[PDB]
Amino acid sequence: YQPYRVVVLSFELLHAPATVCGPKKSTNLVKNKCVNFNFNGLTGTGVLT
Amino acid sequence: NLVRDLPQGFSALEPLVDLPIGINITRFQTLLALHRSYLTPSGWT
Numbered sequence: 001y002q003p004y005r006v007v008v009l010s011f012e013l014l015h016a017p018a019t020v021c022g023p024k025k026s027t028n029l030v031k032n033k034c035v036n037f038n039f040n041g042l043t044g045t046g047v048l049t
Numbered sequence: 050n051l052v053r054d055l056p057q058g059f060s061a062l063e064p065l066v067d068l069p070i071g072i073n074i075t076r077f078q079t080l081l082a083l084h085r086s087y088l089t090p091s092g093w094t
Binding site for chain 2 (some may be wrong): 015016017019
């Protein structure tokens, strides 16, 4: 007989761009070394100066 | 520096912001400011 607070969280995927998202945190920038950096969707291999 | 017609210079017209509306769109219309009627001569415009 104990009660339950059923929570139904519906996440839409209609013809509207994403509005709610979680981050990918966190890392520190490293300079003067070969790092496979990722900058907000820009992915590349190189030395940062 | 001109009066009525468009200027003659070249301007790079920078962005302001993007909006995620995602709706169809066909027609626009502008809004104008009309100081409402007073005792200065219906009187609009």
